[PDB]
Design an enzyme around this catalytic site. Sequence first.
Site, PDB file in Angstrom:
ATOM      1  N   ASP A 149       0.867  -1.196   0.000  1.00 52.40           N
ATOM      2  CA  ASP A 149       0.000   0.000   0.000  1.00 52.40           C
ATOM      3  C   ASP A 149       0.894   1.234   0.000  1.00 52.40           C
ATOM      4  O   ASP A 149       1.520   1.557   1.000  1.00 52.40           O
ATOM      5  CB  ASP A 149      -0.851  -0.046   1.276  1.00 52.40           C
ATOM      6  CG  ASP A 149      -1.837   1.123   1.340  1.00 52.40           C
ATOM      7  OD1 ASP A 149      -1.777   2.027   0.514  1.00 52.40           O
ATOM      8  OD2 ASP A 149      -2.707   1.074   2.231  1.00 52.40           O
TER       9      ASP A 149
ATOM     10  N   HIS B  90      -3.657  -1.368  -0.789  1.00 54.26           N
ATOM     11  CA  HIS B  90      -4.770  -0.669  -0.167  1.00 54.26           C
ATOM     12  C   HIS B  90      -6.064  -1.379  -0.467  1.00 54.26           C
ATOM     13  O   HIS B  90      -6.247  -1.945  -1.548  1.00 54.26           O
ATOM     14  CB  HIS B  90      -4.812   0.759  -0.738  1.00 54.26           C
ATOM     15  CG  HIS B  90      -5.539   1.700   0.160  1.00 54.26           C
ATOM     16  ND1 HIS B  90      -5.031   2.070   1.376  1.00 54.26           N
ATOM     17  CD2 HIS B  90      -6.755   2.323   0.005  1.00 54.26           C
ATOM     18  CE1 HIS B  90      -5.912   2.932   1.947  1.00 54.26           C
ATOM     19  NE2 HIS B  90      -6.927   3.071   1.133  1.00 54.26           N
TER      20      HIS B  90
END
Length: 233
Positions: free
Chosen positions: A171, A202
């Site tokens: 992420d 994410h």
Amino acid sequence: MLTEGISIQSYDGHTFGALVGSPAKAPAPVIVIAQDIFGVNAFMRETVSWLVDQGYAAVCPDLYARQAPGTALDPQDERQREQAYKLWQAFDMEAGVGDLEAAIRYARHQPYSNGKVGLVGYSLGGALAFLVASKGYVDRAVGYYGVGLEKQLNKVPEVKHPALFHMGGQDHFVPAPSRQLITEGFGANPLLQVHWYEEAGHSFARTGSSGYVASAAALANERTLDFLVPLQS
């Protein structure tokens, strides 16, 4: 989407709605869900269903009610993503924390409440989960892919109840330098846990996200449920 008739009041007087789900077996602990930047939308409805199916009640408050009540945006739609980012940039974090604290107080005494309350937040809501954990409003807090935590590390010593964070190792809201700061800082307080899912970015626990990774979603979700089960009666 919100549950009609549900209203919660913040310390400053502002009122807001929420999406609520209660289990067939009650009283039960209640989980306040802190939204992401898309408002109380389909994935918040899925989160309520997931927690209710596990025996919790759930309350997802409309944190955008100070800007645009009832905002519920589709993360697949480009124009609605643009709208989400604009609302996020204008979002008052401190007022968001106070609105969650009001929803937590509300969650302590509903018909279905057993008196214990946890909090689960996603991205914007994961940042808010750490801030709420630093105030001690909830019994347990969980953040999925919270953004900006490396700028809130001076609050680590203020966490006095458990708080669990799931982070994607791919992420890029939390790049290597940020991951090192968070890992070192959180490591000083045993009430904090932060797990890194190395093959996930994410939004890895949302099935319709381009970032979904079923193995990381399943491991993070079982760890969230194990972490919340002490709230059960």
